[PDB]
DNA sequence: GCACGAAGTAAGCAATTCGTAATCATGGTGCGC
DNA sequence: GCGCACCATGATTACGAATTGCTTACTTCGTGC
DNA sequence: GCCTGCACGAAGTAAGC
DNA sequence: TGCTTACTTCGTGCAGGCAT
DNA sequence: GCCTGCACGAAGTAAGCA
DNA sequence: TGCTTACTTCGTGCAGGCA
């Protein structure tokens, strides 16, 4: 059977204190139950706001009384809930705390504290603090307040409840600047819609387990429990408010019972007196317990696919708390329900499934881990030296210890550049991987770099936004850490003002590179106005697209407006700003302007005949320069060859006068002779190569004078260096001492992207020779083609953007086939193609 | 092997009509299912009032379409639900009606109508009208509207739903003056707390079965179904409103579906389009059906003690309707669940338990009765000649027919003075015992007295309050019936005004006896002011207790105030009204005044020294005068001439010689009771004059009998347990299926008979009581 | 416009560590003296 | 028949690539005459 | 079980033997 | 001139309904 | 973790001076 | 013929959302 028990190890005075506290808590929870009973019995009372306020007041007082249990945090020992010893686990948490209060936040956890206090004064001495729907506080924060015994924070009347502890719970979290991870961010996004969303609903909607959403009740974990724990431990203990609450709550409780007796007369023949409620405790609870059991067995049968018989048995066994079931060891589940399948238990208890179907553990080994650490997130929240201590003392088996260690390491070895040694040293230095990730988000860059082996790659992989800041020239480690701590992240540092960034010791070039305002500061003289434009509009391209009038409004010059939109000199001098800007934004290029508009249209728009001819293509200028073929006739001449000088010298002059309306036949041969006269000069200048000195100039531009002359002295001349660059001879370029990847990537475009994908310089060289540019690799290359070049499937998945489809234990070829048929990677219909939707549904994101 | 089937016997045009109506109902119920799906899936949607309004609108439209099924009430025949032919039963109801609509109010009853109409346009063409929790109407009234096909009454919009059909359902019942019996009165008491209380919850709280709470869907039965049927049939059919609803509902349904598609975007990635809902009907229903099955199997395991396997099998077989399980014959339960015990089936199906453990029926005979009449209340709702016709046609076996007959008669033979012959004649004259009791409640005294054998005792036992009115001198049968029909009951006749009672032809002495205002009319000159005081305060003793100032206000005289409180002449002349009245109400008697007060205190209160000190066998003619006073001169001289003298008559009276007093010709019970005090009460308890004589000799007064005598003591005197329960004031505790010994043990353990009704339910189960009797006495919870 | 820094980054280099392909462990399955 | 040959899958080896630090050797920026 | 409604003996006050 | 029938005024109480 | 939208310099082709 | 601004179209990579 299930074991609920605990023993009292305090003094007799403390014994009387704890008994009085627990009995007042039972009185308060009786009130909770009686108010819900009245709500269920009368349809009029179900709508009464007074009765709901009374119900929430009872919840508040129950929480206050619960917080005062085990104040010295030592009056109880060997607290057992459903057969799990909480004493050992609470000690291993970073914040420690009382095992009594830690137990009472579980379903029917009061049964241990009740036995420890030899309580028999009531029928069911129940105390519960898991209220959700009608709770006047945010439920998780309520439970965490009880776990940490905060009587100062537990309000004793509904009016005293602050909005930052209820619907505006987000305000209280932001007040204390607590590091929040991605999972907690998605959970908060759900909770902002409805703070009273039940936790299993968040788990279902986010595709996590209940254990993943809640987390460990300690600031060093991940989940809503861990998040509130982080927030609460940073709240200083307000002793005066605690004493005031203790003074008020007893007299308040008697007032609530009298208010209920007064209110029950409005709806019943027999008023709900305290005597009546004590003499009917089983009548009140029975309905609520029955609906609990029904909903629990339904969730087990529906969402977890457990047989109706087994699901109903388990709902009966654990008072219908699916949170407690999914954290119960397999042996105990089989003890209370012998027909349970191991597969069903692995279905409901996802920690057991992870320990078996990934770490190949025995059911008993996984039971060890579940009894000691409850969940995987509980293992991650436990210090590594604590696990080694448990293993040395013989309290943990070898298989369980090895599995827990590999679980701890895997949380960090997944990071790029961190292996077993660096993860080992990080865990030694900071205890558990959750704390490591916490220090990473808090931007403790120097604190992390002090560990042996934490270099540039590890910092770029761990500290968010460190890679973006440290890559900027002039910004060193200390400046990056200072900025990230001052503003709160790379995104917040990028949004900072120019003046305050100058105050931090940033050059105008550094700020210009950070914000990307070089193009904007090429127009406006200063950086402040460019940054303000980036604030208002958000993108320089949007500022370019802005109409001429709105650009003139709050603008500086019309020549500046023409420089912004890239208006040609001919187009800006031939027309006004409005018409020229409209033409440029409608056609794009001056050649398209000359092609799709007629000469008469250009004249009507107010262009000089010579200027209107210059707006037209240079073919027009050549035609009129040779023998004045005419502004009216040169257009019809260019209308046949589609504005192409090559097709003009091809066909016979007889075929030329055929298409054009009117053409002199003697002139028809003088224009073909002039067309052939220029295709000999277009070809003479088209096939041209630059000089050796010009290659030297480009090399000095790209890699500086020193490395350029080193390359020139190594090979023949700068012409040979350019020949090797155009052929993508990365291997030969790297042979030169003093030439590395930061020079080759600056010489050969696209080498940096290929090296970032994990490609050997020889592999990047082969790829660049095969496809010629990374853009053509990403769109054109196929996985089999890349395997012909000798690339591993990991590099192929990296370079083709198919990392999502491979992360679900799937191959790269069939992954590319989906990106081939449909447009994107994101695109029931899969059963038509014959796919197992299991992984697609499993990985949500 | 459950049989859900029905055959169509209308025309092809009518066939298309019925098919179109059924398909529109399926559309509406799909809307219901989809709104429920959204509500169960999201906790935020569970609180969305807009989604609830949409859901209730869908429910309303489903009900409206359901009412229009089988309007000619002849388009279907051989309607089979779970293997029961409803055609035969609906015909035997007083109001008849459509077997199609009668079937559709059952769980998965649409499966018979769906087969009758060859419906295949949807995956599960389900139409259900049993909604309870979220139903915008009172659920039982909703179902009774559908069963009677009242399309005029089914609202089509939540805003058009009248309060008299929802939270104020009591108004609609009172509007039509429908006779309500005690079981229906307790059911109404529960429903006033929560009109949407599910019927099995009412069954638990009242300690009844579900069939007892529901009753037959017909005005001549007992239960909430029967009550609403009584109320609905008295509502005239508003044809124009029905046509208006038929006009509106199609476009309203299309607007509801558009509103659902718009609202579903707030909660889902794929909006709930009609196409999506039709192409996913099994996914939507899958969750809801499983929750129904779980609740049903759980209730079967806990409240009925059925094995988990068998309970889950029964819940799955009948789609989780415990009302349907308790009305299913044993053969069907064993067919769908072969491991079911006969004892488990008798636990869940209380009609089967009654037919076996009381009428010694075979399981097959009880199954016969359950197939034909569903429940005991269904047997009581069927005419007796209908049952005899069924027996003559061979449709009912010998054992089943005899059991049904004994059940019908027992409903009337239990009344005092009604035996087998009189019950037989009453059933012949009015068809079924429910109709007999109904006419009794309707105060149809002349209609009942027309039956051969219906005399004074039978009328006093049947017509409520007839015994109280007819006992008043001068009030005959016709006047009693007139008053009971004019005011609505003996209590209402007592509350009537004096002027309107005088207009009916009542003497002032008759009204004074009825209202009990003789003491009040001895103070006030007229009857109207005494009646107004009885209205204001309710009791003459309450008027006596009134303070001196409130009695003086709107009062007449101070001497009258002193006469009311019974103030002695010495106490009223020695002090004023205030102090004397306070002393009299604090001490009671002048002797206590003189004992507990000092002479100096009396002087200080303003009393004269002399007054304060004072405050501090017969002959033959003499006995003959008393005899002339008690029984008149004639009977007195008759008694004197029969015996020795008036002294001998007095000697026999003091010894309670009732037997010898009754020997005298011309001397009856009304004379002996006026001579021997307490004889009237003992005769009214059903005691032989010899038995009353023995009791009066043994204890000396009825007051000392009621407090001192024990049931064994009275059984030593030779009294039947019925007479013992009558005479000891335990008639309440015995009428609740308890014996007289345990009734006296309850009056002994707990203080009074009233004090047993406020005891803990745990201590009553400790005494070995069933929740039926516990609910009769106090009531769960 | 160019001297002339003034920090700051690119490159090298040895030792260590990462990390993924190569191989080993292990449990089946099929062709032959 | 009893061994070995060839797979098949997951686990573990193993060795080339990347990383960690530390130290020069140039490289943009950027003032001032 | 409260409530209406006479009964009746007790007892203090007077007329009559 | 002092003891009896006689007769109100209390004070207490049972009986008979009716309602649960 | 993909994806659109920028930033921004690269680069191939010609007029403008030189 | 040759050295610069001048207009065109990419191609290279970083960042910010969103599921
Ligand atoms: K290293
Ligand atoms: K190996
Ligand atoms: Mg403290
Ligand atoms: Mg050891
Ligand atoms: Mg890694
Ligand atoms: Mg630590
Ligand atoms: Mg370091
Ligand atoms: Mg930098
Ligand atoms: Mg090199
Ligand atoms: Mg026959
Ligand atoms: Mg009888
Ligand atoms: Mg009839
Ligand atoms: Mg008669
Ligand atoms: Mg009469």
Automatic annotation (TrEMBL), chain A:
The record's annotation in InterPro entries points to: Hlx-hairpin-Hlx_DNA-bd_motif, RuvA_2-like, SAM_5, Topo-V_HhH2_2nd, TopoV_catalytic_dom_sf, TopoV_HHH, WH-like_DNA-bd_sf
SS bonds (residue pairs): 313-337
GO terms (BP aspect): DNA repair
Q: By what name is this protein known?
A: Topoisomerase V
This chain is encoded by the gene named top5
* Ranges in a coiled coil: none
Positions bound to Mg(2+) 4: 470, 472
Protein residues bound to Mg(2+) 6: 739
Residue numbers binding Mg(2+) 2: 413, 415
State where Mg(2+) 5 binds.
470, 475
This entry's Gene Ontology molecular function terms read: DNA binding; isomerase activity; metal ion binding
What does the entry list as the binding residues for Mg(2+) 3? 449
Native organism is Methanopyrus kandleri
User: Locate the Helix-hairpin-helix DNA-binding motif class domain: which residues?
Assistant: 410-429, 446-465, 467-486, 559-578, 621-640, 655-674, 731-750
Keywords from the named record: Isomerase, Metal-binding
The question of whether Flavoprotein is a record keyword is answered with no
Annotated residues for binding of Mg(2+) 1: 265, 268
């Amino acid at each position: 059977a299930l074991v609920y028990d605990a023993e009292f190890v305090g003094s007799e005075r403390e014994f009387e204190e704890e008994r009085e506290t627990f009995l007042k808590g039972v009185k308060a929870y009786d009130g909770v139950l009686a108010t819900r009973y009245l709500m269920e019995r009368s349809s009029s009372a179900k709508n009464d706001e007074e009765l709901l306020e009374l119900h929430q007041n009872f919840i508040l007082l129950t929480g206050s009384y619960a917080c005062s249990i085990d104040p010295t945090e030592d009056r109880y020992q060997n607290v057992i809930v459903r057969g799990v010893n909480f004493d050992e686990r609470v000690q291993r948490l970073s914040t420690g705390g009382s095992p009594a209060r830690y137990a009472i936040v579980y379903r029917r956890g009061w049964r241990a504290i009740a036995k420890a206090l030899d309580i028999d004064e009531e029928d069911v001495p129940a105390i519960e603090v898991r209220a959700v729907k009608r709770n006047p506080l945010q439920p998780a924060l309520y439970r965490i307040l009880v776990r940490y015994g905060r009587v100062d924070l537990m309000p004793v009347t509904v009016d005293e409840v602050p909005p930052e502890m209820a619907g505006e719970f987000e305000r209280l979290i932001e007040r204390y600047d607590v590091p929040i991870d991605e999972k907690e961010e998605r959970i908060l996004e759900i909770l902002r819609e409805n703070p009273w969303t039940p936790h299993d609903e968040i788990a279902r909607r986010l595709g996590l387990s209940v254990s993943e959403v809640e987390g460990e009740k300690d600031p060093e974990s991940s989940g809503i429990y861990s998040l509130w724990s982080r927030v609460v431990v940073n709240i200083e203990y307000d002793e005066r408010t605690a004493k005031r609450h203790v003074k008020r709550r007893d007299r308040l409780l008697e007032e609530l019972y009298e208010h209920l007796e007064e209110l029950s007369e409005r709806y019943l023949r027999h008023p709900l007196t305290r005597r009546w409620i004590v003499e009917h405790k089983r009548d009140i609870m029975r309905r609520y317990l029955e609906q609990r059991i029904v909903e629990c067995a339904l969730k087990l049968q529906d969402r977890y696919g457990i047989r109706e018989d087994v699901a109903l048995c388990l709902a009966r066994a654990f008072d219908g708390s699916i949170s407690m079931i999914a954290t119960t060891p397999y042996r105990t589940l089989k003890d209370v329900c012998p027909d349970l399948t191991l597969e069903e238990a692995k279905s409901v208890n996802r920690t057991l499934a992870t320990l078996i179907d990934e770490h190949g553990l025995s059911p008993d080994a996984a039971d060890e881990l579940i009894e000691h650490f409850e969940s995987i997130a509980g293992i991650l929240a436990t210090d590594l030296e604590e696990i080694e201590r448990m293993y040395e003392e013989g309290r943990l088996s070898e298989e369980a210890y090895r599995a827990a260690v590999e679980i701890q390491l895997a949380e960090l070895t997944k990071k790029e550049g961190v292996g077993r040694k660096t993860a080992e040293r990080l865990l030694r230095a900071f205890g558990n991987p959750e704390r490591v990730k916490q220090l990473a988000r808090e931007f403790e860059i120097e604190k992390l770099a002090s560990v042996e082996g934490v270099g540039e790659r590890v910092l770029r992989s761990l500290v968010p936004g460190y890679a973006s800041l440290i890559s900027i020239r002039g910004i060193d480690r200390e400046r990056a850490e200072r900025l990230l701590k001052k503003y709160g992240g790379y995104s917040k540092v990028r949004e900072a003002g120019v003046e305050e960034l100058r105050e931090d010791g940033l050059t105008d070039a550094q700020i210009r590179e950070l914000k990307g305002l070089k193009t904007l500061e090429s127009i406006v003289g200063d950086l402040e106005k460019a940054d303000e434009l980036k604030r208002k509009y958000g993108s320089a391209s949007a500022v370019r697209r802005l109409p001429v009038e709105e650009l003139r409004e709050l603008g500086f010059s019309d020549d500046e407006i023409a420089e912004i939109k890239g208006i040609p000199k001919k187009l800006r001098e031939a027309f006004d700003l409005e018409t020229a800007a409209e033409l440029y934004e409608r056609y794009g290029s001056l050649k398209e302007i000359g092609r799709r508009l007629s000469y008469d249209d250009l004249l009507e728009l107010g262009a000089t005949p010579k200027a209107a001819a210059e707006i037209k293509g240079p073919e027009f200028k050549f035609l009129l320069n040779i023998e004045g073929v005419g502004p009216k006739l040169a257009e019809r001449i260019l209308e046949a060859v589609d504005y192409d000088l090559e097709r003009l010298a091809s066909l016979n002059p007889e075929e030329l006068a055929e298409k054009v309306e009117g053409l002199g036949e003697e002139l028809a041969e003088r224009v073909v002779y002039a067309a052939r006269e220029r295709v000999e000069s277009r070809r003479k200048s088209g096939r041209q190569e630059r000089s050796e000195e010009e290659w030297k100039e480009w090399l000095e531009r790209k890699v500086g004078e020193g490395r350029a002359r080193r390359l020139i002295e190594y090979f023949g001349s700068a012409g040979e260096v350019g020949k090797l660059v155009e052929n993508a001879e990365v291997s030969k370029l790297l042979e030169v001492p003093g030439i590395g990847d930061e020079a080759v990537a600056r010489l050969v475009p696209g080498y940096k992207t290929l090296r970032d994908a994990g490609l050997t310089p020889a592999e990047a060289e082969r790829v660049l020779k095969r496809y010629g540019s990374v853009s053509k690799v990403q769109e054109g290359a196929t996985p089999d083609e890349l395997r012909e070049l000798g690339l591993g499937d990991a590099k192929i998945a990296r370079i083709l953007g198919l990392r999502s489809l491979v992360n679900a234990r799937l191959d790269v070829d069939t992954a590319y086939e989906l990106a081939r048929r449909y447009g994107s990677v994101s695109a029931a219909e899969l059963r038509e193609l014959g796919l197992s939707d299991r992984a697609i549904a499993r990985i949500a994101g």
